[PDB]
Coordinates of N, CA and C in Angstrom, one line a residue:
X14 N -5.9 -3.2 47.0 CA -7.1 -3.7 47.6 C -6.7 -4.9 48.6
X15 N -7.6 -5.7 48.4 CA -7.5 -7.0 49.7 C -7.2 -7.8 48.9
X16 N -6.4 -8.6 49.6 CA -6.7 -10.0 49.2 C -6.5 -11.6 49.9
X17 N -7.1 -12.3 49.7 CA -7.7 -13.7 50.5 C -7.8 -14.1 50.0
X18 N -6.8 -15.6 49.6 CA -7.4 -16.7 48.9 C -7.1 -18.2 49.9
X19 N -5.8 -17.8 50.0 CA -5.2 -19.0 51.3 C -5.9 -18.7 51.8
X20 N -6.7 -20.0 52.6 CA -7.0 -20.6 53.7 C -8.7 -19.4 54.0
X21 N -9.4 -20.9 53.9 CA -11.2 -20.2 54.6 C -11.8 -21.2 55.0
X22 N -12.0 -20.6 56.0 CA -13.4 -21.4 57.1 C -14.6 -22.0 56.4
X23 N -14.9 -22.8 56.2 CA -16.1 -22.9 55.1 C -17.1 -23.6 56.5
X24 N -18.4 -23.5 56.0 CA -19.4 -23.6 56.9 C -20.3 -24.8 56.6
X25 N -20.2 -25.8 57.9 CA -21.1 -27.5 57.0 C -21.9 -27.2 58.3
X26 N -23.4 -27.6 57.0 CA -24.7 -28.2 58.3 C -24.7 -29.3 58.4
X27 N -24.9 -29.7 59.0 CA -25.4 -31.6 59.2 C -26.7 -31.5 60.4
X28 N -27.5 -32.4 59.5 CA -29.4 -32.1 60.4 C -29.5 -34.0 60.0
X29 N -30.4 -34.6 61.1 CA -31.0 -35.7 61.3 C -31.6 -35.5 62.3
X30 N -31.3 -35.5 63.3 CA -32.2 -35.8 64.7 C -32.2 -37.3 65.0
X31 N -30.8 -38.1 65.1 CA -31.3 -39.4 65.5 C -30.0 -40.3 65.6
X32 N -30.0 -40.8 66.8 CA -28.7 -41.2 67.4 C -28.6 -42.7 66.8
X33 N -28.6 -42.3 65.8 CA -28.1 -43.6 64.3 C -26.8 -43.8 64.3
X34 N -26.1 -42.8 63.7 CA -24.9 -42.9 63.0 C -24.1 -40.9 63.5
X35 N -24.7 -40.3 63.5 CA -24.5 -39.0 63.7 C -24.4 -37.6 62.9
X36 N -24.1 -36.9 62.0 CA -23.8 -36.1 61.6 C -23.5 -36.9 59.6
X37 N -22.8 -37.7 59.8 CA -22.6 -38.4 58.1 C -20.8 -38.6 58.6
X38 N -20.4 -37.6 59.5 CA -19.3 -37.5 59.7 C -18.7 -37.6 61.1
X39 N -17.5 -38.3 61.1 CA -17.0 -38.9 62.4 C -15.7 -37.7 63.0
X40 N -15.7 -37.9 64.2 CA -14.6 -36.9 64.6 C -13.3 -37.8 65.2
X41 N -12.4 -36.9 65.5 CA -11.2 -37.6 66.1 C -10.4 -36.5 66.9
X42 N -9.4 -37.3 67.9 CA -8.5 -36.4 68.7 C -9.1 -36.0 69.9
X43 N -9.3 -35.0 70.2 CA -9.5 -34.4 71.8 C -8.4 -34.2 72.7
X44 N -9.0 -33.1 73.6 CA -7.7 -32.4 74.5 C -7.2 -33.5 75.1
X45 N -8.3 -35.0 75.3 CA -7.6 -35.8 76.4 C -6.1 -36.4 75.1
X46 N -5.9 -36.4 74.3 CA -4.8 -37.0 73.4 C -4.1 -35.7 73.4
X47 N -4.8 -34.2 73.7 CA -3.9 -33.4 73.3 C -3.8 -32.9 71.6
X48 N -5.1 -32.9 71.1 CA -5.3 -32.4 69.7 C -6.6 -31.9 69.8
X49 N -6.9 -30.9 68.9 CA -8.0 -30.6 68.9 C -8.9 -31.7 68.3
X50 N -10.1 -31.0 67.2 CA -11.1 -32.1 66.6 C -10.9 -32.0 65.1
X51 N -11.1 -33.2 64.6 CA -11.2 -32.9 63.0 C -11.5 -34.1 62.0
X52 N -12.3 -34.3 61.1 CA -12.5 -35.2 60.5 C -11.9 -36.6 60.5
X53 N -12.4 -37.4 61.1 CA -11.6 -38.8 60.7 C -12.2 -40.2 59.8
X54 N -13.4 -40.0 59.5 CA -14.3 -40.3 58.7 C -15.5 -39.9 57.8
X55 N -15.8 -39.8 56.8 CA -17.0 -39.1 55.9 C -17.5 -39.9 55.3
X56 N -19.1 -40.1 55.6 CA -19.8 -41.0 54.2 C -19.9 -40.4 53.2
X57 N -19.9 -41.7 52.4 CA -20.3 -41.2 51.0 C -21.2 -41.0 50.3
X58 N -21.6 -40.2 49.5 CA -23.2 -39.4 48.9 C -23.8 -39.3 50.1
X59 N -22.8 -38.5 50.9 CA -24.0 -38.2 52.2 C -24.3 -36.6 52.1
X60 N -24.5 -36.5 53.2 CA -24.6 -35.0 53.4 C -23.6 -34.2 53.8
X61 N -23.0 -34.5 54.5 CA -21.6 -33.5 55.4 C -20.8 -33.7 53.8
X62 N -20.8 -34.8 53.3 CA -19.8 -34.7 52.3 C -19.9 -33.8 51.0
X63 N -21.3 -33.9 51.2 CA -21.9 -33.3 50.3 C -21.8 -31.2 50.3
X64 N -21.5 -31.4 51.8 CA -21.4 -30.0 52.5 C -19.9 -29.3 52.0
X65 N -19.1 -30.7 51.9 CA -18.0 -30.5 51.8 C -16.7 -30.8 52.2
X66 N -17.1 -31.3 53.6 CA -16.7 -32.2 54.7 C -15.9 -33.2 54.0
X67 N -15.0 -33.8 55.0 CA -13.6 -34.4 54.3 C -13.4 -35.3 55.3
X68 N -12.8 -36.2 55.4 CA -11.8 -36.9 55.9 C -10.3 -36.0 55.8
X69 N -10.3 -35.2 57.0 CA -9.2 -34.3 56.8 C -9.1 -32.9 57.5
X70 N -10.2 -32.2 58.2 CA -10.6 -31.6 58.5 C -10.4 -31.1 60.0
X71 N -10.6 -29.9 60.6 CA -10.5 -29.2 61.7 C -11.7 -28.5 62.4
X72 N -12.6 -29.3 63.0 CA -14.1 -28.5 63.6 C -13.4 -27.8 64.7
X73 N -13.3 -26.4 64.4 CA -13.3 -25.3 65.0 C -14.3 -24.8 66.0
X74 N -15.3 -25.0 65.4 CA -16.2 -24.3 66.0 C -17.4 -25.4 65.5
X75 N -18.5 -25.4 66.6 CA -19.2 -26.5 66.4 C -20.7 -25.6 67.1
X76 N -21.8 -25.1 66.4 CA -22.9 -24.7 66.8 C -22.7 -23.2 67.0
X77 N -21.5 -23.0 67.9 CA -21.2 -21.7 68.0 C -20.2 -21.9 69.2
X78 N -20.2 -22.4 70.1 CA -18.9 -23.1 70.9 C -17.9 -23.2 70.2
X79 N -17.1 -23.1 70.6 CA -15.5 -23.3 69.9 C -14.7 -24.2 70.7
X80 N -14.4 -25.4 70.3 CA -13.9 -26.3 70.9 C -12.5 -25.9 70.9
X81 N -11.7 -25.9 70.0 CA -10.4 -25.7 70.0 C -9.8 -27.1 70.2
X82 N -9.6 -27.1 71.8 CA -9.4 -28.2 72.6 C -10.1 -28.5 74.0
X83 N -11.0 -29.6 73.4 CA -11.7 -30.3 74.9 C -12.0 -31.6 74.3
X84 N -12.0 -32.3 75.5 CA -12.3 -33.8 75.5 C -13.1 -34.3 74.5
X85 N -12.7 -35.3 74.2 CA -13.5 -36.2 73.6 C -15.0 -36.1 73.7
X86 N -15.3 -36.0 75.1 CA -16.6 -36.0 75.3 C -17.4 -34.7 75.6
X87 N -16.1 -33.8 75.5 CA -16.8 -32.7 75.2 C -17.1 -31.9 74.0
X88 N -16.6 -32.0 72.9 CA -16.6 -31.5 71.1 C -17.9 -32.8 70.7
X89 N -18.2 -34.4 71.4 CA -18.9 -34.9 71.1 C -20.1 -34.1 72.0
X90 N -20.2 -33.6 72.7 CA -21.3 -33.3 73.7 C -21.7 -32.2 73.2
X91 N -21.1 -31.4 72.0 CA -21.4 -30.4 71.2 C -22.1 -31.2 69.9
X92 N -21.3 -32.3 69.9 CA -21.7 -32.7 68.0 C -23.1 -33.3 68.7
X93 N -23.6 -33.9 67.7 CA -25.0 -34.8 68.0 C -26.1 -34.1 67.7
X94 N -26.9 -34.5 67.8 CA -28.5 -33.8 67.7 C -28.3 -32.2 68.4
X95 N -28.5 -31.3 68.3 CA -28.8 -29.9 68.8 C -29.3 -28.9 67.6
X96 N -30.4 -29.1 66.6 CA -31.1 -28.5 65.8 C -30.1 -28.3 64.8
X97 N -30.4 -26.9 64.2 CA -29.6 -26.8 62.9 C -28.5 -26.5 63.4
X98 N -27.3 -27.4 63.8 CA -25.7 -27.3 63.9 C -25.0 -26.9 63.0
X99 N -24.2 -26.2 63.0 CA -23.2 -25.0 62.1 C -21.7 -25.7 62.4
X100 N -21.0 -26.8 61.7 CA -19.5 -27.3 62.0 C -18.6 -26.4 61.4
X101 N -17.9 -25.5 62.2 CA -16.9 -24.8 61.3 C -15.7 -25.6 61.5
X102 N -15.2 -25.9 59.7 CA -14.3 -27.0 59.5 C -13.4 -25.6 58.8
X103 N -12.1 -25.7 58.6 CA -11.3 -24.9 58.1 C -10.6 -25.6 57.1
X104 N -10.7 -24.7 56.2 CA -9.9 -25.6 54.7 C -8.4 -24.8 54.7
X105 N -7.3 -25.3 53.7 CA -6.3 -24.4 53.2 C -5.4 -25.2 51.6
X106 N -6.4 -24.6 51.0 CA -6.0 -25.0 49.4 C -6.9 -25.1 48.3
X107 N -6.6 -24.9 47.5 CA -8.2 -24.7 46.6 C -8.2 -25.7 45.0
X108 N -8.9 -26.2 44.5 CA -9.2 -27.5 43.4 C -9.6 -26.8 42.4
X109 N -9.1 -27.2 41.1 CA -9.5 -26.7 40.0 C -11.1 -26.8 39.4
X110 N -11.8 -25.9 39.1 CA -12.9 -25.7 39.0 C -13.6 -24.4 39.7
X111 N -15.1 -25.1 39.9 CA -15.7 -23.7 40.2 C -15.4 -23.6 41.9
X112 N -14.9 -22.1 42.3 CA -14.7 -22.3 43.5 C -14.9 -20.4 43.5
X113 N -14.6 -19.4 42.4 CA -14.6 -18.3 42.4 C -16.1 -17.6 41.6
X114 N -15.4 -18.0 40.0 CA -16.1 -17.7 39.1 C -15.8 -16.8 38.4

């Protein structure tokens, strides 16, 4: 048969509508450094965290755009208020507990 366990895209929403704080979660890197984007901050009992979201992370894909690599101001010019946003963060490793069942 198949099999996949290494490594999965997992799917975080983050919704507010309000140029507070942003998402619960902060980004870092950009093509101008020459990296793509990926967690560099997460509140706590928030929401992204709650999503699943890490300090640690790789936003691949943000709404449906795929950043990969672009500026600073451009993966931010994706993140922010834009309705129900879809961050695709990529994981690779899995924690004891419920994750299969």
């Amino acid at each position: 048969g198949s099999s996949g366990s290494s490594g999965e895209v997992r799917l975080v929403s983050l919704r507010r509508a309000k140029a507070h704080e942003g998402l619960g979660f902060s980004i870092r890197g950009g093509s101008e450094h020459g990296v793509g984007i990926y967690v560099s901050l997460v509140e706590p009992g928030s929401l992204a965290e709650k999503e699943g979201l890490r300090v640690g992370d790789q936003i691949l894909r943000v709404n449906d755009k795929s950043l990969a690599r672009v500026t600073h101001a451009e993966a931010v010019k994706a993140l922010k208020g834009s309705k129900k946003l879809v961050l695709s963060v990529y994981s690779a490793g899995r924690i004891s507990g419920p994750s299969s069942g």
